[PDB]
Amino acid sequence: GSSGSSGRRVRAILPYTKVPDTDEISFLKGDMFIVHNELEDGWMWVTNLRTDEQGLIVEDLVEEVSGPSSG
């Protein structure tokens, strides 16, 4: 266990179409996730809270969940 991040939270602003014959996962707009590992080429090993599965999503199809406003 080395120095890193705790766990960034993001949300799918739009529905994606996982790739056929791969680990990728299909999510829907509104579905949250949990950033566990930060990959390269714009990718991260997160886990959908709805499907409760792990996969590879792009940081371009998600948004950062942070702010003063509640919720």
Q: What is the CATH number of the domain that holds 41?
A: 2.30.30.40
* 63 DSSP assignment: E
Give CA–CA dist 47/50, Å, rounded.
Answer: 9
Give CA–CA dist 46/29, Å, rounded.
Answer: 15
**Residues 6 or more apart whose Cβ sits within 8 Å of residue 68:** none
Number of domains in the chain: 1
List C-alpha distances in Å: 61 to 2, 3, 49, 71: 28, 27, 16, 20
| Domain limits for position 49 | 1-71
Q: How were these coordinates obtained?
A: NMR
